[PDB]
Design a protein around this ligand. Sequence first.
Ligand SMILES: [Cu+2]
Ligand SMILES: [Cu+2]
Ligand SMILES: [Cu+2]
Ligand SMILES: [Cu+2]
Lengths: 645, 650
Amino acid sequence: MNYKKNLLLLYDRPREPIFMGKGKSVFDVPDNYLTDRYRPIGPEIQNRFGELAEERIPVRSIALPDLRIPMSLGRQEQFSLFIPRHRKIAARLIDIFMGMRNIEELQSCAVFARDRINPYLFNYALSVALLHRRDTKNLDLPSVVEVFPDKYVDSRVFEQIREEATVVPEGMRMPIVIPKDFTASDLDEEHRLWYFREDIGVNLHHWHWHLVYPFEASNRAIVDKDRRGELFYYMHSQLIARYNFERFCNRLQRVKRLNNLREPIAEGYFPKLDSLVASRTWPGRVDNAVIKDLNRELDQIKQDVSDLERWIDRIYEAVHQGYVVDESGNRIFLDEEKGIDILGNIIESSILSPNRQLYGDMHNVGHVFLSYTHDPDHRHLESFGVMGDVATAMRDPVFYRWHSFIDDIFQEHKIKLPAYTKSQLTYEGISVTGIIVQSEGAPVNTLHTYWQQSDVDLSRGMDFVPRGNVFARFTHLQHAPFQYVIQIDNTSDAQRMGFVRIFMAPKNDERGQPMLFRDQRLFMVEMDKFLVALRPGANRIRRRSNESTVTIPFERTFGWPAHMLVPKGLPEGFPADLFVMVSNYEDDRVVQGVRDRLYPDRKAMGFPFDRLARTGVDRLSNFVTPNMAIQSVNVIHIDKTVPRT
Amino acid sequence: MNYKKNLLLLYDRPREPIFMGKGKSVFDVPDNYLTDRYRPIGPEIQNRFGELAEERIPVRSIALPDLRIPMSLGRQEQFSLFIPRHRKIAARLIDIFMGMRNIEELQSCAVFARDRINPYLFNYALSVALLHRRDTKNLDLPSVVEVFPDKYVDSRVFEQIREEATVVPEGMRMPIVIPKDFTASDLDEEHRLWYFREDIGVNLHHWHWHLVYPFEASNRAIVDKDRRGELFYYMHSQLIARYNFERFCNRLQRVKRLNNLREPIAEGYFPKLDSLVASRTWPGRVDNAVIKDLNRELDQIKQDVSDLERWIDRIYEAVHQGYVVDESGNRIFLDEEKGIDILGNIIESSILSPNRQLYGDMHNVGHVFLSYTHDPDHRHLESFGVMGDVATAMRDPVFYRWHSFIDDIFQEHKIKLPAYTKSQLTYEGISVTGIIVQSEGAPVNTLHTYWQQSDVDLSRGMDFVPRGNVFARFTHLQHAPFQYVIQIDNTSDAQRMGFVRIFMAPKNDERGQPMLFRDQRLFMVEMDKFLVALRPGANRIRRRSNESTVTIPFERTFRCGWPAHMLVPKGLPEGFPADLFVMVSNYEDDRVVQDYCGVRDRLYPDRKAMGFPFDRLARTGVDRLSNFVTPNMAIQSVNVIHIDKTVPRT
Ligand SMILES: [Cu+2]
Ligand SMILES: [Cu+2]
Ligand SMILES: [Cu+2]
Ligand SMILES: [Cu+2]
């Protein structure tokens, strides 16, 4: 019905009151729905904004549960899911929206609440409700860039957009270029990774992943998605693999973990963002900032660094011991199957953790500590830095250090698992004899990258700005389209089903030597995984880059961003090993890419390379079984700006 | 294509050679496909049976893997999946059929093999392949009663069917009545349970359950179905709950477990079956037979009773300890979630058992011991009794004693789990205020049962019998149709999703008082479990007996779940008092996303343990059902009346 489309109007201009009229419509709000500020002049308003609209949406006056808790968070305050208190507020609001029987009462509850609670919080609470309420399925939620551009764009543009929109008539408006590589100069070598850390695409992917797999909400089934623990491990683990790749393409070494929390943090980061909702800017972190004990009475944070250290010490112990202990006192064993999944829930701290009280909230609390170095006891009445919000956390370099550490902890369980036997990763009969890649107008086994401007309408997000279009020009990494061509022999006499698993790693190390397996296995980034039917004899499989199951199409973002599928490489060319494996789909099958049910692969995530090598294996070229293939690829960057065409 | 329909012709007349022509068709078999006996007279045969056939199916000559192992089992021998050796033979044949490229070779391999290997084995191996192969989905396999009636019918009828078919012309043939209550007289009080033990329906359900959820070495993909261990526990556990119900309706006490294996078995059983494939009869077991150490060199069985006892001693230890140990030496914990599932695989010995070598093959080996009391060292060259075949095991009373024991072991784990808290089984907002049942022409809260003859065409199964129809008349328990009517209040302000869980148990004890929970919880039989959407305020839910998720209709079981006609216990002529119970649980917690009862092909659609409200002990203060209840539950006194009359099928 219309109702579904009418809720989407709530996302329009989040700070403009709901009675101001969104798109080609306007809401006919009761007077008891007006805020205390505006209610005493309600007559002057409803009339003043009503016209020039094709529709007037009526809204029925309902009972409405107490909205005290939802309204506890200030309107001009920041909202983060990492802060203990906010979690309880959001989870309560989510509960209200979720608890509205009809799609009409959801519209009524929403319309009332919208102008009383924190915009950032509202957006989250609604987003979560719509996606998991049963009436509002298969919907198109507007990109959070378009509703909250302040979390994605240098604050400098805002006063240009205001100028352009006020001075120049519609149709003659110039697109606003969004600054790139703007957070640090060349004195900071970290500035080179702007195209990854600060890319709109990857920041959206991270935000959205945490939307669909929350770690604590209310009602366990929403949190309890198949293998979400392992997902949390793997997804974040791939972020760093990809980051470490991009590091090598900018003449840097692999990211160093946060060894220990007492030592200073070398790399500072000023994000250059200005929250229009908080009307303040996000604080920066200086070079050689030190983590400090938190005492944020308001936010309900009373945590010492030693608490964090204690959690880590215990988690390590469990991992080495090989088992954990639940609240009850019983032991649960970190086996080959569910071990990783358990560990994930323990480490991030999802309510699925078998003993939150003992093993703590290790990952999340780390995000808060790192974001509050500048004001840990709230004496300066300052908010958290960028690492305190999932939406912005990936912008900071320290993210990769903290997430690097966390990964090492997971590793110190994976290295305990028994090596995959020759048997276990052989497909009797199947043999892959070669894989290549081809781009139009480029040699074989060669990938190209470059810069590319794209346009986004940030009009819905620009509150109290003259209506019209406001196009912004993003510059971001892009790769030329390509396709894999895989030669597979059956030699069985029957149709064989198989999973094609494609990863890519660097060929050598930072010192220029052909990488060993122990090293290289951790640098393999997944590129594709798809099901294929093989006829007896010979099969030529072809797969386009845009068919990738790791990626989501550009149009959707505006899943990992498509333009970020290929590492940057170097102008002189960057050498890389492309790897493919065909596994026996009958074993890997899940009787029942992203998936809203169960995860469609029985094998562990990162399956060929998650575990250590079997004895005698030393490098990739002798790890291989017949049903695998390696290929030298060369990744060439070109510093030029292509259009979108 | 046609090929799918052509394989179904293999099931036709299992002992008639494949070149004799099945249904309205006949196979055009190569001469190298003929048997050594018939090869030298091929010229005379292909021609002789070519006549009267509409279609002629060609068959291409292929290589054909070595069929030595499949052919090791004699043609006139019995076949059981419990016997270690047979498992290896079948698993190998399954492997051959499974490994054939196209459905042109599946048909070719089959056609060749069919007349060289044991019919019972062939049927199994094919059934398994078809049910789990790629091209052959949704294919309706003929009822195993129709292909092998010898496992389901008193041997006496066979010489009547032969007489009738030879003497009387088609169309004028009288339906052959199948004897009921024929295995024992009234001196044996056990004879009363014929309508359950010997019912075609329940024996088919058991056979089929083991088809779709094997434990067999085979391949891990086929055996590893979601929670099959818990399934094995629950399904068999419900068999005994239902059996114990039917016992109470025949003035008998609850089934006594097999305490210890050294003491005699009081209840003998002569099954009165004659295997036309083995051309012999199944042996009986005498009263006060004792289990004896097996030494069946041929079958590859060298097991002592003490071995069994040792496995039991160890399993008990693990259950009390609260954990098991895998081959590697690590400890795996029998937790609230997966504990039961693990234990199931350990006890039956499914290849999924985390340590077969230590905890043994306890359930299966028990079936063999009990079936070989009459000839344990093979000195008398006799085959196993009825307990040695899944197809027939439920006919013997000892089945329920052995399966009763096994259940007690599972229980020993369940009583360690923490009681469900008031919180855990409350649905905040939902309140069930009443449940009733209504049958056409009968007071409220009253169920009726009776006898009913039905007809089945056993024509496909009657080898070397003049072609035509051969209808057999089965007498079996039946219940009058009914429907539940459940009054549920929402009081929330939002549409609430809920699982309706319906069980039924006996009302009072031996002394005539309300049964206590500790006792009654184990006698609750599942009657239905279905999803329901509740509007704010008041909701009147109605559910027909024939919509039950525990059951499958008549049509299926005569051409899979529990037979529909066996859904209701028999009750008494004077009326049998019973507590009907319903619970509405919060489906959001119980949901298993996903796009029934015992057999579901997909993952199991319920996060809660099987049995749910009654699998665990009572929380403190609870004592009987009427104070176990939460608002979202309801109890109702039902009365089950039997009437000794034979209704027609209409
Ligand atoms: Cu994250
Ligand atoms: Cu993080
Ligand atoms: Cu069984
Ligand atoms: Cu059994």
